[PDB]
Symmetry: C2
Subunit: 432 residues, 2 copies
């Protein structure tokens, strides 16, 4: 067997393997008649038609199953002789497969080092002490009243402080940007604006008079063919709708689903929101400050295999969002995926080390109250707790999440906890 273990750097090593033509071919014939025998579909029956011709002439489909086995078939043997152990999964980077010659592929595996964390006390824990008094309730209620100010058909030009119901669609330098356009787009004021140029074209003209704008995408834009390329957008200026407050009437209150219809019912729906919004935002802030603190305490050098696995999931899933086209993945900037990925894998090493060596058990009290809180998001809390209590694989997942939280907590209580007073507004204004 043709194998070549190269070293890239430290953790990473590039084991380049080449499988011979007939070594592939015989394996195709083998797995053809195998899967044919078990699934009862031997073309006709189990005594005719040599899989030799089936493979060579029209066995490009089965070649996925075959090469799928052969990558791990040559791997499993080669790693025995050389003592090669990947960190979870090896990054199989293939160049090309010539049909009827060989199959060369670069097996870029990483090794998992023993992680250690330092600066546990040096980490700043934020407790954003928000206590949502009627100042915060009615302050945010006024923010709601003024920001959700009703729509009204403006007579004139578009401006910064207007909504406009339009659409944008066309091409970027002659290419159809797959799903990157909104037929009947609502441009709403008050919130942030899009790329300088786009919204500028919109607010450069009056309603009714429809035209195309040509704006180049930023190099900060998250697709290689769209960024730097000029983009023509067929702007159909239909309806310019200004925001203005008539009053906080039951007509407005009704649009939040308030059956009671009165503003006092609006406060009550807002209390039901404020319950899970306040709890999850506080928990998000202390969790965020913790995770940021852990990584910033120890920006460790993680195995790239875990990053690559995260990147495969994130590339396929992103490209699924961009029309489902695989090719789109390969033109999203890698470092926008490696953002969440790096943090996921670093925290995976750190918190894993914590629950392992600090011997953190699924603390029955901690996971009890955790389950009670997520159950109080459902209609019947008590019975959700009671059913989870029986269920094995639920209590596996509840063990893990209680231990993620408990691993954060082990270093959280060890860290510089700072109980800092803020308001409901500041809590979510500093987020999105």
């Amino acid at each position: 067997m043709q194998v070549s273990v190269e070293t890239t750097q430290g953790l990473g090593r590039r084991v380049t393997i080449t499988i011979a033509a007939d070594s592939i071919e015989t394996a195709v014939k083998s797995e053809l008649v195998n899967v044919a025998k078990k699934v009862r579909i031997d073309g006709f029956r189990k005594g005719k038609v040599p899989m030799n011709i089936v493979a060579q002439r029209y066995g490009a489909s089965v070649r996925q199953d075959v090469l799928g086995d052969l990558m791990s078939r040559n791997f499993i043997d080669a790693i025995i002789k050389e003592k090669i152990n990947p960190a979870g999964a090896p990054t199989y980077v293939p160049g090309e497969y010539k049909l009827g010659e060989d199959f060369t592929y670069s097996v870029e595996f990483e090794v998992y080092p023993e992680v250690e964390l330092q600066g546990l006390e040096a980490i700043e824990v934020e407790k954003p002490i928000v206590e949502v008094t009627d100042a915060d309730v009615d302050g945010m209620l006024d923010t709601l009243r003024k920001q959700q100010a009703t729509w009204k058909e403006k007579d004139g030009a578009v401006e910064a402080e207007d909504r406009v119901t339009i659409d944008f669609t066309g091409s970027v330098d002659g290419e159809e940007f797959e799903g990157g356009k909104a037929s009947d787009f609502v441009l709403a004021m008050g919130q942030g604006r899009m790329i300088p140029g786009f919204e500028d074209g919109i607010k450069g003209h009056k309603a009714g008079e429809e035209f195309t704008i040509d704006v180049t995408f930023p190099e900060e834009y998250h697709a290689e063919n769209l960024k730097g390329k000029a983009a023509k957008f067929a702007i159909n200026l239909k309806k310019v709708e200004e925001r203005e407050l008539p009053e906080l009437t039951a007509e407005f209150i009704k649009r939040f689903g308030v059956e009671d219809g009165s503003v006092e019912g609006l406060r009550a729906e807002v209390r039901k929101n404020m319950e899970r919004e306040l709890k999850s935002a506080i928990r998000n802030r202390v969790k965020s400050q913790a995770i940021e603190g852990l990584v910033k305490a120890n920006d460790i050098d993680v195995p790239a295999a875990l990053i690559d696995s995260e990147i495969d999931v994130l590339r396929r899933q992103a490209a699924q969002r961009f029309g489902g086209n695989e090719k789109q993945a390969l033109e999203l900037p890698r470092e926008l995926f490696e953002e969440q990925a790096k943090r996921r894998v670093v925290v995976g090493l750190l918190l894993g080390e914590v629950i392992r060596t600090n011997e953190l058990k699924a603390d029955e009290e901690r996971v009890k109250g955790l389950i009670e809180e997520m159950a109080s998001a459902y209609e019947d809390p008590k019975e959700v707790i009671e059913f989870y209590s029986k269920n094995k694989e639920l209590m596996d997942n509840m063990r893990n999440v209680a231990l993620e939280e408990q691993a954060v907590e082990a270093v959280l209580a060890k860290a510089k906890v700072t109980e800092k007073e803020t308001t409901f507004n500041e809590l979510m204004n500093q987020q999105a």
Copy 2:
């Protein structure tokens, strides 16, 4: 959300869950803004463009993520309140997703029955008593030179007992069909017979003729829209080759792959091949006798969920080979999938119950010896066993196969063991 359970058939409990239009759309906007903020692909940036219009107008490309979440989201609560749970996995039978509508999907499954094996004494174990003597080697050797004789170019009429390397293609009923054609298809004699009309047509014509044979596919054939339809096969008699025996010449010894050239090397390579195939034959004979013993003696009630799992693996794998056409999967007569699946699920329950209740542990010496036996095939056997010993993920699968064979053995030694003498030829005659 709305849930409603209905008994399909006994264990089959159709939990029909109506997910309301808004229950979908809100979860769509959720998974949109989530994936946007974590991957930082918010179109432009994390402060613009409501996910409302993104969902409603072109949010088809997130319905995998959304419905993928909702399948567990609605189900997890539904099973809590009412008491209701699948054996392994629930079969989600969904409606066609019309947008701006309640997605009602039939969440079917079967509950797990107490599996028991019976008629252990009635199960007759076949121990086919064979040896690799020069009698069996010369028997197979004579069959080898007498069956696998060299080919000569024939100019004349084709028989059933000729070779003919033809390129056939055409159309079934008038419609072109994928996969069912082969350029330089070798109709070799000696081995079994093809479908009636086809090979009868080939042998009904003399070398040089380019014609067509319109033959009807059997109603027993492995696909619906092909079976029962006549099929015009444009047979171009390309190569016609007569089957003739010269001798077991050094020309032939080389052609078999034996570089050694002298017949002593043909015998050596035959000893190595006969070694591993004798092992795999005896293994397959006692294994298949025992497996079909347990299954055909105990046609137990198996939860359809396990069948769906196996069938999804088998339909992916098969339809990938049938041009990658996932629609054609559902078109294959399902009993060909359920053939293997029935065996896998019944064995999985029976042998599972054996190793569980009888406390069958992966015996270190037994799994070690099993690995010696299979590693014999590999490049360095005792180092294979040695390296495997470290890797738990692989030793998990080695524990699987060890306990499957050990569970077979726990009933094998209990079953009516009958030693039945055979030759090497008769051992594989039916199996091949």
